[PDB]
């Protein structure tokens, strides 16, 4: 005798980017320095491979400041420029001088 | 669950199942054009 079942299936299925690499150099043009002294904003040059999180963290670690926001753009010469606005607890002129 | 065995009835049922599968395969493969369906209507 064979003990076979009835209820069967209808279909069969088969059983190198750190804080020193992130920030290359600051921007020291007249407009950038005006923003530094007036707008409490540090203007930096960063790498092509860095995003706003990494730029914020690198600024915070390297300069020991609180970052309010980061606004990044890509320049025609293939470099990235970042405007890092710090909190009101810090004076950008002091950080630029220091 | 069925606890019973047959000698030749099982083979005949297997043959019938295979024939039905082949016939359905033929019908499905030949029904790819509507002309065959129209012809079958007057068949």
């Amino acid at each position: 005798k064979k003990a076979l079942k009835v209820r069967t299936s209808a279909t069969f299925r088969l059983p190198r980017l750190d804080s020193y690499k992130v920030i290359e150099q600051p921007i020291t043009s007249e407009t950038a320095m005006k923003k530094v002294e007036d707008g409490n904003i540090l203007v930096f040059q960063v790498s092509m491979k860095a995003n706003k999180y990494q730029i914020k963290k690198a600024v915070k670690e390297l300069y020991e400041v609180d970052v309010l926001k980061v606004n990044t753009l890509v320049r025609p010469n293939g470099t990235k420029k970042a405007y890092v606005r710090l909190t009101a607890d810090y004076d950008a002129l002091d950080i630029a001088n220091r | 669950m069925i606890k019973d065995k047959d000698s030749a009835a099982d083979a005949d049922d297997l043959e019938s199942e295979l024939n039905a599968m082949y016939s359905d395969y033929k019908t499905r493969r030949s029904e790819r054009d509507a002309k065959f369906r129209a012809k079958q209507a007057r068949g």
Partner: peptide
């Protein structure tokens, strides 16, 4: 429908050779 998908090709062939 197409119920043949209940048997894979190897099962169907090995049962066809039984006949």
């Amino acid at each position: 429908l197409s119920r043949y998908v209940k048997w894979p090709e190897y099962v169907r062939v090995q049962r066809q050779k039984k006949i």
